[PDB]
Paper text:
ChTg is the precursor (zymogen) of the mammalian digestive enzyme chymotrypsin (CHT), one of several well known serine proteases. Firstly (in the digestive tract), trypsin cleaves the peptide bond between Arg15 and Ile16 to yield π-CHT, which is an active enzyme form.
Of these, 175 files had a resolution better than 4 Å. Finally, 146 data sets from the point group represented by space group No. We used REFMAC and Coot to refine the structure and reduce the R value to about 18%. We observed that the most mobile area, particularly residues 139–145, is near the missing loop from residues 146–152. The largest differences were observed for residue 146, with average positional differences greater than 3 Å.
Author numbering:
A (entry chain A), B (entry chain A): 1 to 146, 151 to 245
The structure:
């Protein structure tokens, strides 16, 4: 997991304004969630050939579908895999008013076929520490909510929850983590999309997109579900099903 | 339906600032949705002894519960009914990015017992016309998201969808309706709460709360699910289940 067959390239422009375009196929766990009509409404991450993780406020159902191996949403020429959803597992502790514990798992009807452009992100262990100030990366097609149709990427630093409350106040709970406010926006992340950090030569999922600045301000950070706080529920669900 | 045993009293102050307090028990279809721990996160409306209607973005599950007959959320002295949910029916056309077709039905495990303070709102027919400029009423405990703990009410006018787009642009779809921007806020409505209008001596459900001004501005209107566009799906669901 976490070692793309096609290595990412991140330059100085990933750190300012709205980030930069990714090298095609270099984020191979990134998937798109689409409704029965093909409309993209959220993102997510592959964790093995049978399972995808996303946000609970996305409200996914078994009539939505997972699209793997995509780079350009406007192209019909690249190889992709459209995968049906057998069952949806929403975390029972999710709360639609506070948006805390914002995670859902999707079990696929038939496995994805892994390749150079389709493979899994690594999950953290519950006790991993990702320190404030660490440079991490968010990817997605989130800018298309307001524009480039190819996958974008931005490098931005994690914040402490105390510093995040200087921006968002009592909205910030223990199962959340924030990143950004460094001269770059967080809006390229789709709801439910990945925030990954590189440790020991492997990329690991640290956050899941929950919400960001309503004006995509370069001085307001994004808010993510904290995966370390939820990975135990993830592994219990996989083992029981 | 739609004829409270205890008549509402609406004064001139229902029309300015943040509205006014309701006469206790005078909105008898109003219910509160709470999680398994008793935390209020949304509103809804009784349509008979076995069924409640609310918003789909509330994300209700069968472990949440319906509370009927409530006036003061801070009191333990008033009679109320706590009702279990047997099954949740989300409208398959709901979309969590656009927030269109924002309606869900809840079927109760055991019927509510109707009384002077607990009874049903009337549903419109699909072809009813509620004209722009009509004064309607929104009720709820929505102000407690930012404060009074008793049920509030405000009188505010419906807008045309074209005039609403001067405020919200391409967010506004055909299955939505807007009200307010007249010197009074819409924020007393809980997510999923009622917008009712009085015709022929009976109160009828015209809207379900979807979203409002992020600053509760007295000059920005609220956005509601248009019940006339969704009542056919409601009646099909009741007949099949």
């Amino acid at each position: 997991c976490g070692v793309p067959a096609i290595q990412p390239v991140l330059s100085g422009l990933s750190r300012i304004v709205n980030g930069e375009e990714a090298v095609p196929g270099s984020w191979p766990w990134q998937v798109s969630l689409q409704d029965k009509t093909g409309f993209h409404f959220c993102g997510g991450s592959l964790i093995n050939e049978n399972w995808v993780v996303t946000a609970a406020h996305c409200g996914v159902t078994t009539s939505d579908v997972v699209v793997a191996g995509e780079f350009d949403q406007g192209s019909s020429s690249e190889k992709i895999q459209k995968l049906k959803i057998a069952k949806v597992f929403k975390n029972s502790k999710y709360n639609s008013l506070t948006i805390n514990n914002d995670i859902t798992l999707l079990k696929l009807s038939t496995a994805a076929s892994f390749s150079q452009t389709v493979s899994a992100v690594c999950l953290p262990s519950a006790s991993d520490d990702f320190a404030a100030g660490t440079t991490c990366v968010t990817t997605g097609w989130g800018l298309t909510r307001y524009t480039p149709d190819r996958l974008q990427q931005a490098s931005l630093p994690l914040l402490s929850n105390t510093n995040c409350k200087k921006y968002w106040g009592t909205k910030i709970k223990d199962a959340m983590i924030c990143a950004g406010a460094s001269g770059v926006s967080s809006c390229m992340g789709d709801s439910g999309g990945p925030l990954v950090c590189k440790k020991n030569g492997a990329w690991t999922l640290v956050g899941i997109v929950s919400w960001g600045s309503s004006t995509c301000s370069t001085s307001t950070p994004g808010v993510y579900a904290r995966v370390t706080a939820l990975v135990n529920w993830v592994q219990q669900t996989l083992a029981a099903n």
